[PDB]
Amino acid sequence: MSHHWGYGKHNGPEHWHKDFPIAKGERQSPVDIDTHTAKYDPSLKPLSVSYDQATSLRILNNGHAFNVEFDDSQDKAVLKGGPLDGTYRLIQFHFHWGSLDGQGSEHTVDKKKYAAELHLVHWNTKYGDFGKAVQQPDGLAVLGIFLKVGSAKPGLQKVVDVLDSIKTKGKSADFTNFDPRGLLPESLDYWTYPGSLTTPPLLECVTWIVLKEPISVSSEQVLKFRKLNFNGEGEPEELMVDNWRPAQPLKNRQIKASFK
Ligand SMILES: [Cu+2]
Ligand SMILES: [Zn+2]
């Protein structure tokens, strides 16, 4: 929110608190997931990812990442169960990634950084619209999935192949008839905790659900992410890499596990 924040030395995560003081708040994201301290929670309900009727619309370079946007005017693609009360509707997904394969994720697992992290963003339908949802402590649910470099992910290739058409900030392209189920791992085992948006405005509205099993993507797929630009057309080229916030203090939170 507001202008001029980014991921450089002069406007990156260490600077955000000056315009977004909640950056130093009590439930900021991402965090390190200490797997030995997370506790199994038998009260968690089964997690339900219901994306069969998902209706993708468009892909946009917003100068911070790229978003694949969905029709959220009806319950076409929803997340329910797990730690969640009620129904959360899919609005968009995006990624965070590194300049090198050893960094890029926002969450870490026993301090391990993955090459990238996928965020599927959903809003609680009891609040009527996304903008109202971000005024509520249970307004959003983000499903986070780690990416490691190995074999190609077939379900990612349609995304990689459109990126040359959205190289610079402000560009968009049609992205209809995409199935986001092709981005999931086999297992839905997860960790969950209460947190925030990981970019400005850093609002403390998110139930995080982070899957334990990473997806594998090829070196060639992640290399195509790294050819995007932060800048607009006609401006000095600034590669879109290292668009991740580091782990923040856990403070008075417990991370729960869905699995023993
Ligand atoms: Cu501003
Ligand atoms: Zn994100």
Swiss-Prot record:
Belongs to the alpha-carbonic anhydrase family. Residues 3-259 form the Alpha-carbonic anhydrase domain. Catalyzes the reversible hydration of carbon dioxide. Can also hydrate cyanamide to urea. Stimulates the chloride-bicarbonate exchange activity of SLC26A6. Essential for bone resorption and osteoclast differentiation. Involved in the regulation of fluid secretion into the anterior chamber of the eye. Contributes to intracellular pH regulation in the duodenal upper villous epithelium during proton-coupled peptide absorption. Changing V142 to F/Y: Strongly impaired activity. GO terms for biological process: angiotensin-activated signaling pathway; carbon dioxide transport; morphogenesis of an epithelium; neuron cellular homeostasis; positive regulation of cellular pH reduction; positive regulation of dipeptide transmembrane transport; positive regulation of synaptic transmission, GABAergic; regulation of chloride transport. The modification N-acetylserine is found at S2. Changing N62D: Strongly reduced activity. This is Carbonic anhydrase 2. It is an enzyme of class 4 (lyase). Activated by X-ray, histamine, L-adrenaline, L- and D-phenylalanine, L- and D-histidine, L-His-OMe and beta-Ala-His (carnosine). Keywords: Acetylation, Cell membrane, Cytoplasm, Disease variant, Lyase, Membrane, Metal-binding, Osteopetrosis, Phosphoprotein, Zinc. Target of drugs used in treatments against glaucoma disorder and breast cancer. Optimum pH is 6-8. Its cofactor is Zn(2+); Co(2+). It comes from Homo sapiens. Pfam families: Carb_anhydrase. Zn(2+) binds at H94, H96, H119. It is found in: Cytoplasm; Cell membrane. Interacts with SLC4A4. Interaction with SLC4A7 regulates SLC4A7 transporter activity. Interacts with SLC26A6 isoform 4 (via C-terminus cytoplasmic domain).
